mmCIF file of C-alpha atoms and ligand atoms in Angstrom:
data_model
loop_
_atom_site.group_PDB
_atom_site.id
_atom_site.type_symbol
_atom_site.label_atom_id
_atom_site.label_comp_id
_atom_site.label_asym_id
_atom_site.label_seq_id
_atom_site.Cartn_x
_atom_site.Cartn_y
_atom_site.Cartn_z
ATOM 1 C CA UNK J 1 118.709 -126.612 64.108
ATOM 2 C CA UNK J 2 115.893 -126.761 67.024
ATOM 3 C CA UNK J 3 112.431 -128.023 66.153
ATOM 4 C CA UNK J 4 110.710 -125.358 67.922
ATOM 5 C CA UNK J 5 108.457 -127.961 69.635
ATOM 6 C CA UNK J 6 108.967 -126.092 72.848
ATOM 7 C CA UNK J 7 110.186 -122.248 73.585
ATOM 8 C CA UNK J 8 112.528 -122.003 76.913
ATOM 9 C CA UNK J 9 113.233 -119.356 79.364
ATOM 10 C CA UNK J 10 116.049 -119.273 81.811
ATOM 11 C CA UNK J 11 117.503 -117.707 85.070
ATOM 12 C CA UNK J 12 119.842 -118.533 87.706
ATOM 13 C CA UNK J 13 119.054 -115.739 90.222
ATOM 14 C CA UNK J 14 122.017 -114.118 89.175
ATOM 15 C CA UNK J 15 124.539 -116.194 90.859
ATOM 16 C CA UNK J 16 128.190 -115.140 91.538
ATOM 17 C CA UNK J 17 130.810 -116.323 89.108
ATOM 18 C CA UNK J 18 132.607 -118.063 91.945
ATOM 19 C CA UNK J 19 129.726 -119.931 93.782
ATOM 20 C CA UNK J 20 129.558 -123.347 95.634
ATOM 21 C CA UNK J 21 126.059 -123.791 93.988
ATOM 22 C CA UNK J 22 124.928 -123.888 90.396
ATOM 23 C CA UNK J 23 121.409 -122.787 89.833
ATOM 24 C CA UNK J 24 119.391 -123.881 86.703
ATOM 25 C CA UNK J 25 115.695 -122.713 86.391
ATOM 26 C CA UNK J 26 113.789 -123.277 83.149
ATOM 27 C CA UNK J 27 110.423 -122.147 82.012
ATOM 28 C CA UNK J 28 109.479 -124.466 79.156
ATOM 29 C CA UNK J 29 106.485 -123.547 77.012
ATOM 30 C CA UNK J 30 104.638 -126.215 74.674
ATOM 31 C CA UNK J 31 104.493 -124.334 71.462
ATOM 32 C CA UNK J 32 104.046 -127.289 69.247
ATOM 33 C CA UNK J 33 100.196 -127.891 68.793
ATOM 34 C CA UNK J 34 99.623 -130.893 70.805
ATOM 35 C CA UNK J 35 100.307 -132.405 74.381
ATOM 36 C CA UNK J 36 103.641 -133.655 75.029
ATOM 37 C CA UNK J 37 104.814 -136.134 77.362
ATOM 38 C CA UNK J 38 107.080 -134.834 80.088
ATOM 39 C CA UNK J 39 108.888 -138.083 80.018
ATOM 40 C CA UNK J 40 110.117 -137.156 76.427
ATOM 41 C CA UNK J 41 111.415 -133.797 77.594
ATOM 42 C CA UNK J 42 115.158 -133.529 78.548
ATOM 43 C CA UNK J 43 117.021 -130.452 79.284
ATOM 44 C CA UNK J 44 120.946 -129.842 79.347
ATOM 45 C CA UNK J 45 123.335 -127.394 80.981
ATOM 46 C CA UNK J 46 126.841 -127.405 79.940
ATOM 47 C CA UNK J 47 129.755 -126.507 82.482
ATOM 48 C CA UNK J 48 133.580 -126.875 82.963
ATOM 49 C CA UNK J 49 133.850 -129.285 86.069
ATOM 50 C CA UNK J 50 136.981 -127.494 87.515
ATOM 51 C CA UNK J 51 137.582 -130.347 89.905
ATOM 52 C CA UNK J 52 136.439 -134.129 89.729
ATOM 53 C CA UNK J 53 134.169 -134.433 92.822
ATOM 54 C CA UNK J 54 130.842 -135.965 93.693
ATOM 55 C CA UNK J 55 128.019 -133.750 92.897
ATOM 56 C CA UNK J 56 124.372 -133.626 94.449
ATOM 57 C CA UNK J 57 121.330 -132.658 92.397
ATOM 58 C CA UNK J 58 118.389 -130.881 94.019
ATOM 59 C CA UNK J 59 114.998 -129.976 92.267
ATOM 60 C CA UNK J 60 113.649 -126.898 94.450
ATOM 61 C CA UNK J 61 110.206 -126.969 92.795
ATOM 62 C CA UNK J 62 108.593 -127.917 89.528
ATOM 63 C CA UNK J 63 104.749 -127.662 88.370
ATOM 64 C CA UNK J 64 102.393 -126.888 85.818
ATOM 65 C CA UNK J 65 98.631 -126.372 84.916
ATOM 66 C CA UNK J 66 96.957 -129.278 83.502
ATOM 67 C CA UNK J 67 93.379 -127.912 82.428
ATOM 68 C CA UNK J 68 92.361 -126.010 85.820
ATOM 69 C CA UNK J 69 94.350 -128.274 88.370
ATOM 70 C CA UNK J 70 97.898 -127.246 89.546
ATOM 71 C CA UNK J 71 100.193 -130.264 89.217
ATOM 72 C CA UNK J 72 103.546 -130.263 91.383
ATOM 73 C CA UNK J 73 106.011 -132.349 89.728
ATOM 74 C CA UNK J 74 108.888 -131.449 91.897
ATOM 75 C CA UNK J 75 109.273 -134.971 93.178
ATOM 76 C CA UNK J 76 109.224 -136.250 89.659
ATOM 77 C CA UNK J 77 112.501 -134.531 88.218
ATOM 78 C CA UNK J 78 116.037 -136.300 88.216
ATOM 79 C CA UNK J 79 119.364 -134.694 87.276
ATOM 80 C CA UNK J 80 122.268 -136.421 85.646
ATOM 81 C CA UNK J 81 125.929 -135.461 85.209
ATOM 82 C CA UNK J 82 127.674 -136.942 81.915
ATOM 83 C CA UNK J 83 131.029 -136.094 80.082
ATOM 84 C CA UNK J 84 131.249 -134.396 76.877
ATOM 85 C CA UNK J 85 133.555 -136.428 74.618
ATOM 86 C CA UNK J 86 135.406 -134.657 73.151
ATOM 87 C CA UNK J 87 135.577 -131.707 75.524
ATOM 88 C CA UNK J 88 135.214 -128.195 73.830
ATOM 89 C CA UNK J 89 136.159 -124.828 75.290
ATOM 90 C CA UNK J 90 134.278 -124.350 78.418
ATOM 91 C CA UNK J 91 132.471 -127.492 78.505
ATOM 92 C CA UNK J 92 133.695 -130.916 79.560
ATOM 93 C CA UNK J 93 130.405 -131.815 81.404
ATOM 94 C CA UNK J 94 126.655 -131.232 81.423
ATOM 95 C CA UNK J 95 123.938 -131.466 83.578
ATOM 96 C CA UNK J 96 120.703 -133.426 82.235
ATOM 97 C CA UNK J 97 117.528 -132.581 83.695
ATOM 98 C CA UNK J 98 114.759 -135.357 82.843
ATOM 99 C CA UNK J 99 111.328 -136.108 84.420
ATOM 100 C CA UNK J 100 109.861 -139.558 85.542
ATOM 101 C CA UNK J 101 107.558 -141.679 83.262
ATOM 102 C CA UNK J 102 104.375 -140.579 85.125
ATOM 103 C CA UNK J 103 105.415 -136.685 85.510
ATOM 104 C CA UNK J 104 102.227 -136.282 83.164
ATOM 105 C CA UNK J 105 101.630 -134.537 79.986
ATOM 106 C CA UNK J 106 102.044 -130.848 79.179
ATOM 107 C CA UNK J 107 99.241 -129.499 77.261
ATOM 108 C CA UNK J 108 99.590 -127.503 74.016
ATOM 109 C CA UNK J 109 100.460 -123.957 74.899
ATOM 110 C CA UNK J 110 101.145 -125.209 78.523
ATOM 111 C CA UNK J 111 104.252 -124.134 80.743
ATOM 112 C CA UNK J 112 106.153 -126.074 83.156
ATOM 113 C CA UNK J 113 108.677 -124.275 85.546
ATOM 114 C CA UNK J 114 111.563 -126.322 86.782
ATOM 115 C CA UNK J 115 114.054 -125.098 89.264
ATOM 116 C CA UNK J 116 117.168 -126.898 90.019
ATOM 117 C CA UNK J 117 120.511 -126.641 91.774
ATOM 118 C CA UNK J 118 123.775 -128.838 92.353
ATOM 119 C CA UNK J 119 126.805 -128.517 94.291
ATOM 120 C CA UNK J 120 129.741 -130.460 95.390
ATOM 121 C CA UNK J 121 129.369 -132.827 98.375
ATOM 122 C CA UNK J 122 132.231 -130.659 100.126
ATOM 123 C CA UNK J 123 130.548 -127.334 99.215
ATOM 124 C CA UNK J 124 133.833 -126.037 97.677
ATOM 125 C CA UNK J 125 133.347 -123.296 95.034
ATOM 126 C CA UNK J 126 133.051 -123.835 91.398
ATOM 127 C CA UNK J 127 134.051 -121.140 88.699
ATOM 128 C CA UNK J 128 131.058 -120.280 86.686
ATOM 129 C CA UNK J 129 133.009 -117.935 84.529
ATOM 130 C CA UNK J 130 134.324 -120.506 82.347
ATOM 131 C CA UNK J 131 131.129 -122.417 82.095
ATOM 132 C CA UNK J 132 129.504 -122.900 78.480
ATOM 133 C CA UNK J 133 125.893 -122.282 79.594
ATOM 134 C CA UNK J 134 126.672 -119.618 82.176
ATOM 135 C CA UNK J 135 125.339 -116.334 82.429
ATOM 136 C CA UNK J 136 124.106 -114.203 85.304
ATOM 137 C CA UNK J 137 120.506 -114.071 84.737
ATOM 138 C CA UNK J 138 118.284 -112.649 87.379
ATOM 139 C CA UNK J 139 114.954 -112.898 85.794
ATOM 140 C CA UNK J 140 113.836 -115.562 82.940
ATOM 141 C CA UNK J 141 115.356 -114.723 79.740
ATOM 142 C CA UNK J 142 115.410 -116.307 76.337
ATOM 143 C CA UNK J 143 119.068 -117.920 76.725
ATOM 144 C CA UNK J 144 120.129 -120.084 73.798
ATOM 145 C CA UNK J 145 123.000 -121.736 75.293
ATOM 146 C CA UNK J 146 121.020 -124.201 77.271
ATOM 147 C CA UNK J 147 119.242 -127.070 75.326
ATOM 148 C CA UNK J 148 116.025 -128.764 75.286
ATOM 149 C CA UNK J 149 115.289 -132.019 73.476
ATOM 150 C CA UNK J 150 111.969 -133.701 72.963
ATOM 151 C CA UNK J 151 112.008 -137.480 72.128
ATOM 152 C CA UNK J 152 115.760 -137.293 71.296
ATOM 153 C CA UNK J 153 115.890 -134.419 68.766
ATOM 154 C CA UNK J 154 116.959 -130.876 69.587
ATOM 155 C CA UNK J 155 113.562 -128.458 69.969
ATOM 156 C CA UNK J 156 115.464 -125.269 71.475
ATOM 157 C CA UNK J 157 118.683 -123.779 71.853
ATOM 158 C CA UNK J 158 122.388 -125.022 70.937
ATOM 159 C CA UNK J 159 125.047 -127.497 72.052
ATOM 160 C CA UNK J 160 128.639 -126.666 72.149
HETATM 161 CA CA1 CA D 201 133.795 -124.063 85.641
HETATM 162 ZN ZN1 ZN D 202 131.448 -138.027 85.998
HETATM 163 ZN ZN1 ZN D 203 133.584 -136.833 84.028
#
Protein backbone atom coordinates (compact mmCIF):
# COMPACT_ATOMS: atom_id res chain seq x y z
CA UNK A 1 0.00 0.00 0.00
CA UNK A 2 3.09 2.15 -0.49
CA UNK A 3 2.83 5.27 -2.64
CA UNK A 4 6.14 4.82 -4.50
CA UNK A 5 7.09 8.46 -4.02
CA UNK A 6 10.48 7.05 -3.04
CA UNK A 7 12.39 3.81 -3.47
CA UNK A 8 14.53 2.50 -0.58
CA UNK A 9 17.55 0.23 -0.19
CA UNK A 10 18.92 -1.19 3.03
CA UNK A 11 22.04 -2.83 4.56
CA UNK A 12 23.46 -3.41 8.05
CA UNK A 13 27.01 -4.44 7.13
CA UNK A 14 25.85 -7.98 7.74
CA UNK A 15 25.75 -7.68 11.57
CA UNK A 16 25.76 -10.89 13.72
CA UNK A 17 22.43 -12.14 15.10
CA UNK A 18 23.74 -11.50 18.60
CA UNK A 19 25.18 -7.98 18.68
CA UNK A 20 25.42 -5.05 21.04
CA UNK A 21 24.79 -2.62 18.13
CA UNK A 22 21.97 -2.56 15.65
CA UNK A 23 22.93 -0.96 12.35
CA UNK A 24 20.36 0.49 9.94
CA UNK A 25 21.51 2.14 6.71
CA UNK A 26 19.23 3.48 4.02
CA UNK A 27 19.68 4.76 0.50
CA UNK A 28 16.46 6.66 -0.24
CA UNK A 29 15.65 7.63 -3.82
CA UNK A 30 13.17 10.32 -4.80
CA UNK A 31 11.15 8.65 -7.52
CA UNK A 32 8.18 10.98 -7.29
CA UNK A 33 8.39 13.60 -9.97
CA UNK A 34 9.34 16.59 -7.77
CA UNK A 35 11.58 17.68 -4.84
CA UNK A 36 10.83 16.32 -1.46
CA UNK A 37 11.32 18.07 1.80
CA UNK A 38 13.56 15.87 3.90
CA UNK A 39 11.58 17.24 6.83
CA UNK A 40 8.66 15.06 5.62
CA UNK A 41 10.67 11.87 5.32
CA UNK A 42 10.42 9.32 8.15
CA UNK A 43 12.05 5.88 8.21
CA UNK A 44 11.15 3.00 10.53
CA UNK A 45 12.98 -0.14 11.73
CA UNK A 46 11.00 -2.70 13.72
CA UNK A 47 12.52 -4.91 16.46
CA UNK A 48 12.08 -6.78 19.72
CA UNK A 49 13.56 -4.94 22.67
CA UNK A 50 14.54 -8.15 24.54
CA UNK A 51 15.23 -5.92 27.62
CA UNK A 52 13.93 -2.54 28.73
CA UNK A 53 17.14 -0.48 28.77
CA UNK A 54 18.09 3.11 27.80
CA UNK A 55 19.24 3.24 24.15
CA UNK A 56 21.64 5.58 22.39
CA UNK A 57 21.13 6.59 18.77
CA UNK A 58 23.94 7.57 16.34
CA UNK A 59 23.90 8.83 12.73
CA UNK A 60 27.36 7.96 11.42
CA UNK A 61 26.84 9.72 8.08
CA UNK A 62 24.10 11.25 5.98
CA UNK A 63 24.41 13.12 2.73
CA UNK A 64 23.13 13.99 -0.73
CA UNK A 65 23.65 15.90 -3.96
CA UNK A 66 21.78 19.15 -4.53
CA UNK A 67 22.53 20.21 -8.09
CA UNK A 68 26.33 19.97 -8.17
CA UNK A 69 27.01 20.70 -4.43
CA UNK A 70 27.42 17.76 -1.99
CA UNK A 71 25.37 18.29 1.19
CA UNK A 72 26.37 16.60 4.46
CA UNK A 73 23.23 16.24 6.51
CA UNK A 74 24.84 13.95 9.13
CA UNK A 75 24.18 16.30 12.05
CA UNK A 76 20.55 16.82 10.93
CA UNK A 77 19.33 13.29 11.54
CA UNK A 78 17.48 12.26 14.69
CA UNK A 79 16.35 8.89 16.00
CA UNK A 80 13.41 7.97 18.24
CA UNK A 81 12.30 4.78 19.91
CA UNK A 82 8.59 4.13 20.31
CA UNK A 83 6.42 1.19 21.30
CA UNK A 84 4.30 -0.85 18.92
CA UNK A 85 0.88 -1.15 20.57
CA UNK A 86 -0.36 -3.72 20.33
CA UNK A 87 2.88 -5.74 20.12
CA UNK A 88 3.07 -8.20 17.21
CA UNK A 89 5.35 -11.24 16.79
CA UNK A 90 8.95 -10.02 16.49
CA UNK A 91 8.03 -6.39 16.87
CA UNK A 92 7.38 -4.57 20.16
CA UNK A 93 9.21 -1.30 19.36
CA UNK A 94 10.53 0.61 16.41
CA UNK A 95 13.27 3.03 15.54
CA UNK A 96 12.04 6.13 13.76
CA UNK A 97 14.61 8.08 11.80
CA UNK A 98 13.76 11.69 10.95
CA UNK A 99 15.52 14.83 9.75
CA UNK A 100 15.39 18.39 11.13
CA UNK A 101 13.33 21.16 9.52
CA UNK A 102 16.29 22.49 7.56
CA UNK A 103 17.82 19.25 6.33
CA UNK A 104 17.04 20.48 2.81
CA UNK A 105 15.11 19.25 -0.21
CA UNK A 106 15.84 16.05 -2.08
CA UNK A 107 15.64 16.75 -5.81
CA UNK A 108 13.47 14.61 -8.11
CA UNK A 109 15.49 11.50 -8.93
CA UNK A 110 17.96 12.36 -6.14
CA UNK A 111 19.34 10.01 -3.42
CA UNK A 112 20.07 10.45 0.26
CA UNK A 113 22.24 7.97 2.17
CA UNK A 114 21.56 7.67 5.90
CA UNK A 115 23.78 5.48 8.10
CA UNK A 116 22.62 4.90 11.61
CA UNK A 117 23.14 2.68 14.59
CA UNK A 118 21.94 2.32 18.13
CA UNK A 119 22.94 0.39 21.26
CA UNK A 120 22.10 0.04 24.91
CA UNK A 121 23.89 2.32 27.32
CA UNK A 122 25.45 -0.78 28.91
CA UNK A 123 26.52 -2.35 25.65
CA UNK A 124 24.79 -5.65 26.42
CA UNK A 125 23.78 -7.86 23.48
CA UNK A 126 20.50 -7.71 21.60
CA UNK A 127 19.06 -10.79 19.90
CA UNK A 128 18.44 -9.60 16.39
CA UNK A 129 17.09 -12.95 15.29
CA UNK A 130 13.62 -12.11 16.65
CA UNK A 131 13.58 -8.66 15.06
CA UNK A 132 10.98 -8.07 12.40
CA UNK A 133 13.13 -5.80 10.22
CA UNK A 134 16.25 -7.88 10.63
CA UNK A 135 18.17 -9.57 7.89
CA UNK A 136 21.91 -9.89 7.46
CA UNK A 137 22.53 -7.62 4.48
CA UNK A 138 26.13 -6.79 3.72
CA UNK A 139 25.39 -4.63 0.71
CA UNK A 140 22.44 -2.37 -0.13
CA UNK A 141 19.42 -4.37 -1.23
CA UNK A 142 15.64 -3.99 -1.69
CA UNK A 143 14.36 -5.00 1.73
CA UNK A 144 10.62 -4.60 2.18
CA UNK A 145 10.67 -5.07 5.95
CA UNK A 146 11.56 -1.46 6.69
CA UNK A 147 9.28 1.48 6.05
CA UNK A 148 9.48 4.96 4.67
CA UNK A 149 6.76 7.56 5.18
CA UNK A 150 6.43 10.78 3.28
CA UNK A 151 4.27 13.45 4.84
CA UNK A 152 2.64 10.86 7.08
CA UNK A 153 1.71 8.24 4.50
CA UNK A 154 3.52 5.01 3.56
CA UNK A 155 5.64 5.46 0.45
CA UNK A 156 7.73 2.25 0.54
CA UNK A 157 7.78 -1.08 2.37
CA UNK A 158 5.45 -2.49 4.98
CA UNK A 159 4.71 -2.45 8.72
CA UNK A 160 4.01 -5.52 10.88
CA1 LIG B 1 15.28 -8.66 19.68
ZN1 LIG C 1 10.53 2.98 25.55
ZN1 LIG D 1 8.67 0.49 25.40
